[PDB]
């Protein structure tokens, strides 16, 4: 400060300006990133590799700002993304939008608590009236449509057109195997992206899909006792002496054969422990391969940790470098453990089917990684939006036909509840228009034009914005029934969530 002491970068103006303004910075694109999104975002992640998406959290985590303002709220956006797969595209914009009313009320001179608390009780009032606007509930996981109907909404809230083949393909991955009652799992259903085939060739093989080359034979048994190992081959040939191969002419003789019998004992000890599939994040060797061909134990030549991880995760396997006779601790899990060609890529396939614990493994055949990973992104955040763990998701208008109802609900009521809080309560019903704007953003019209008509749709729950021109000229697309609703819950959090950090990040002048 004035004094050489007082560590801080936040406060006073730079709070009522820069913090909120820095909060404004990132919500800018989240607008283009939520609901139907025609917008796209190049990102290099410190691979210098471009990637394209509409999602903030993928990007924001990378982005580094002086100020915890940005650094905090993402956690809530994560806290959403943790609990709810999508809407996080939205979860940031409303707070940042709702915030900047304060700095205005600060120019209008409204106190911290005064500005805060109006949003609060209105947020409770929201949390009171928000479930009143539950317009449906989900029903059946076994039904593909009942699932896929919703799933578009989040895929929509990532990317618009693709959602159709996708949402179906998702419940066709059997979101249904899990009850979605107190349980559901990504890693069991895990996306596995095959570069090649088509992007709409993205398929479903229930049970593990490992793009890794499937070696040896097929597993000794399909129940396979599965000993997965980080690097069970560090080489059994040693790299030593002169040439980084040999030094003395007598050296080479012992280098070549030693790999064999060690790996022979190693792959015998794979059979000795009884592993019916051998998984080497370490190298593949033809002898060991032929040993794995002799002992008939299916071989995995190379592993991402994700391989080992999931194998460690799902099978109950434990990946360990073995220069060491393998010992089954990993043991088995999956009742059918296969070789397969999916995308006609050699696909390491383990499968076991259980109401909980079943791997129903999303296999994305795809033409482009940079797409198929963003194609993964929406289905990810779509099935994570499928993750509610209420089979009946108490659905509310998806793509936000809600806000117009609530923008009507609160600020009207907002004045009824009196005192300067009312203005914060009335400011509360404003930033609803964000996604109606944020779609009209990527749709290309004015939120006023939107809201004026979508106030003129009055009590609806249905008509609202979207993509194309029906979010433009009428600003009317049925966001109850385009087939698009959203769960009350993912909605319920964003208000609740974006209530907290927004309220919070204002309070802090240091």
């Amino acid at each position: 400060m004035l004094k050489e002491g007082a560590k801080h970068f936040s406060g006073l103006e730079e709070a009522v300006y820069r913090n909120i303004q820095a909060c404004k910075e990132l919500a800018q694109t989240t607008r283009t990133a939520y609901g139907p999104n025609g917008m796209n975002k190049m990102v290099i992640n410190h691979l210098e590799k471009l990637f394209v998406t509409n999602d903030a959290a993928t990007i924001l985590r990378e982005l580094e700002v002086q100020h915890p303002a940005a650094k905090m709220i993402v956690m809530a956006s994560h806290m959403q993304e943790q609990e709810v797969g999508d809407g996080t595209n939205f979860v940031l914009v409303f707070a940042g939008a709702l915030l900047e009313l304060a700095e205005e009320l600060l120019r209008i001179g409204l106190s911290v608590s005064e500005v805060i608390e109006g949003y609060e009780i209105a947020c409770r009032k929201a949390h009171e009236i928000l479930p009143n606007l539950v317009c449906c509930s989900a029903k059946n996981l076994r039904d593909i449509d009942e699932v896929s109907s919703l799933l578009r909404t989040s895929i929509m809230s990532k990317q618009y057109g693709n959602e159709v083949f996708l949402a179906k393909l998702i419940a066709q991955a059997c979101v249904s195997i899990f009850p979605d009652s107190g349980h559901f799992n990504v890693d069991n259903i895990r996306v596995c992206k095959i570069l090649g085939s088509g992007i709409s060739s993205s398929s479903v093989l229930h049970g593990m899909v490992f793009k890794k080359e499937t070696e040896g034979d097929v597993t000794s048994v399909k129940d396979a006792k599965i000993a997965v190992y980080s690097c069970p081959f560090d080489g059994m040939i040693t790299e030593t002496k002169g040439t980084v191969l040999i030094k003395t002419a007598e050296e080479l003789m012992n280098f070549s054969k030693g790999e064999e019998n060690l790996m022979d004992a190693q792959v015998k000890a794979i059979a000795d422990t009884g592993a019916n599939v051998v998984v080497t994040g370490g190298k593949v060797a033809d002898m060991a391969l032929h040993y794995a061909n002799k002992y008939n134990i299916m071989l995995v030549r190379l592993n991402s940790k994700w391989d080992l991880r999931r194998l460690c995760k799902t099978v109950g396997a434990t990946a360990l470098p073995r220069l060491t006779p393998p010992v089954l601790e990993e043991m088995g899990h999956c009742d059918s453990v296969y070789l397969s060609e999916v995308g006609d890529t050699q696909v390491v396939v383990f499968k076991h089917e259980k109401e909980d614990g079943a791997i129903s493994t999303i296999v994305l055949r795809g033409s482009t990684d940079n797409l198929m990973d963003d194609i993964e992104r929406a289905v990810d955040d779509g099935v994570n939006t499928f993750k509610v763990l209420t089979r009946d998701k108490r659905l509310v208008p998806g793509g936000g036909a809600t806000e117009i109802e609530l923008a009507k609900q609160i600020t009207s009521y907002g004045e009824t509840c009196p005192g300067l809080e009312q203005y914060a309560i009335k400011k509360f019903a404003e930033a609803f228009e964000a996604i109606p704007r944020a779609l009209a953003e990527n749709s290309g019209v004015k939120a006023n034009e939107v809201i004026s008509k979508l106030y003129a749709v009055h009590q609806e729950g249905n008509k609202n914005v979207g993509l194309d021109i029906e979010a433009e000229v009428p600003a009317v697309k049925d966001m109850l029934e385009a087939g698009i609703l959203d769960t009350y819950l993912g909605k319920y959090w964003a208000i609740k969530l974006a209530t907290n950090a927004a309220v919070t990040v204002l309070r802090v002048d240091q």
């Binding site: 002491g5 560590k7 801080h8 970068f9 915890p68 309070r507 002048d509």
Partner: protein, 514 residues
């Protein structure tokens, strides 16, 4: 360099001001929490007077001096410390004028004294003897909690706060020493906070279903493992020589089952019946088969326990820490009235609860484990001090600075000196008092002006302690409000503010030393 005479204090006055502004709301539920980046480079949020000081790396000597002196009071109260910064420099803002009018800072330091004493006298005359009712404790707890966190957050947490202190006064302890154990726990939300009259261990060892649900818990806290090692060489014995390794291979696996079946004995020694779950608790690891050989018998063995727990468990259960197992009666291994290993997330947090003489009450908070959950970890222990202070003093008054006016009124209304020299100081003295309640109101709402001339005329009308409504900005009876100044709390700021202002108000030469 030298900042000479008036200049040296001109530095002192300034460094007080801008920080006082931060704390005009660091205080009350109106009080605004403040965050720290450059204090570390971490993302850090805190509300409290002294801690924020230490958290920041504070280059300015004044602040650098203050963090130490406000500590001693922040040691005791924890609230009123977020208050304390105001009155001090504000008094500088008072007196500097008088020396700017011209006068000795001497006579004003002098002048503060008798005013401090009448205050101290008034502090007696004001302090309201109040009872130990948990209600009376709640409002003292929550007012500090309300100061430090949301009144809601104050409310929801207040119960467990005023609860443990009852069991720590069950010890007839005048203060809070144990039952200070706080536990942050993996959760999506900091919403969840629980009051464990006993303790909580975080581990079930590594083995589930040991009869980990334990109604009758005879607590073996054993800092020695049942896991010494399953391999050839001992736990601390390492050998790269060959012949010495073949020596330990045989009995290393044995000395486990030595200690294992000691417990297997100790189980039947303690119990004779698997019915009562016998709780083994290890500061270090325990072998799976050790657990297995124990778990099957119904022995619940815990490993990797914490030394404070070991301390706590020894004390709370009437428990014992042991370097051996052998055989012992149930009571030789202290008793927990209830023990339940509780899995949340992955980790199974053993609830060892209502230990015999549950001398340590674990206050468990389930949250995101952010500094947000740390942000509520303070007000509690802070409020603990406050109720401990309220436990300390039966004499507690309305908060919200109702005392300030009634101080500033009487102390100024009469000349305690019937002099200039002291009254000059006295004038400045009791003036810096009112800074807090008016600015609180002024920060809340109605300006310093009305609330004062309210509360003054009100006190003038009353003599009741009437104090600001921090959600209104005009006074109420803070006895009725619940915001309550412990005489233990409120007294020490009079010490600090004066005693700090004494020598710092007298400096002329200042220089780099060394």
């Amino acid at each position: 360099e030298v900042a000479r005479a008036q200049a040296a204090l001109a530095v002192n006055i300034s460094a007080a001001r801008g920080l006082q502004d931060v704390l005009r709301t660091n205080l009350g539920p109106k009080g605004t929490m403040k965050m720290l980046v450059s204090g570390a480079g971490d993302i850090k949020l805190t509300k409290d007077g002294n801690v924020l000081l230490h958290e920041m790396q504070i280059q300015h000597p004044t602040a650098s001096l203050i963090a130490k002196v406000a500590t001693a009071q922040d040691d005791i109260t924890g609230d009123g410390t977020t208050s304390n910064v105001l009155i001090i420099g504000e008094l500088l803002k008072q007196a500097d004028l008088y020396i700017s009018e011209g006068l000795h800072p001497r006579i004003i330091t002098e002048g503060f004294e008798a005013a401090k004493e009448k205050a101290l006298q008034f502090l007696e005359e004001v302090k309201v003897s109040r009872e130990m009712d948990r209600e009376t404790l709640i409002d003292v707890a929550r007012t500090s909690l309300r100061t430090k966190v949301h009144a809601e957050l104050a409310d929801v947490l207040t119960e467990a706060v005023v609860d443990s202190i009852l069991a720590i006064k069950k010890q007839d302890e005048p203060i809070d020493l144990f039952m200070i154990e706080i536990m942050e726990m993996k959760h999506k939300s900091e919403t969840d906070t629980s009051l464990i009259r006993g303790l909580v261990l975080d581990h079930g060892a590594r083995h589930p279903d040991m009869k980990k649900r334990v109604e009758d818990a005879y607590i073996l806290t054993c800092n020695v493992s049942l896991e010494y090692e399953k391999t050839e060489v001992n736990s601390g014995f390492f050998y790269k020589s060959a012949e010495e390794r073949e020596k330990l291979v045989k009995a290393e696996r044995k000395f486990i089952e030595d200690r294992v079946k000691k417990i297997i004995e100790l189980k039947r020694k303690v119990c004779g019946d698997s019915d009562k779950g016998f709780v083994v608790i290890n500061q270090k690891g325990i072998d799976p088969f050790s657990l297995d050989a124990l778990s099957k018998e119904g022995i619940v063995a815990l490993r990797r326990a914490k030394r404070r727990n070991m301390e706590r468990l020894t004390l709370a259960c009437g428990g014992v820490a042991l370097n051996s197992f052998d055989d012992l009666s149930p009571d030789c291994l202290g008793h927990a009235g209830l023990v339940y290993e509780y899995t949340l997330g992955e980790e199974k947090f053993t609830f060892i609860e209502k230990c015999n003489n549950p001398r340590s009450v674990t206050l468990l908070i389930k949250g995101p484990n952010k500094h947000t959950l740390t942000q509520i970890k303070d007000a509690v222990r802070d409020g603990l001090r406050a109720v401990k202070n309220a436990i300390d003093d039966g004499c507690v008054v309305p908060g919200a600075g109702a005392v300030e006016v009634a101080m500033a009124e009487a102390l100024i209304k009469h000349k305690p000196s019937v002099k200039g020299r002291a009254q000059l100081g006295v004038q400045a003295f009791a003036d810096a008092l009112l800074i807090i309640p008016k600015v609180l109101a002024q920060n809340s709402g109605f300006d310093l002006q009305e609330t004062l001339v309210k509360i003054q005329a009100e006190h003038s009308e009353s003599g009741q302690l009437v104090g600001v409504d921090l959600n209104t900005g005009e006074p109420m009876v803070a006895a009725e409000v619940g915001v309550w100044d412990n005489y233990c709390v409120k007294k020490q700021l009079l010490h600090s503010c004066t005693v700090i202002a004494t020598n710092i108000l007298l400096v002329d030469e200042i220089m780099r030393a060394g």
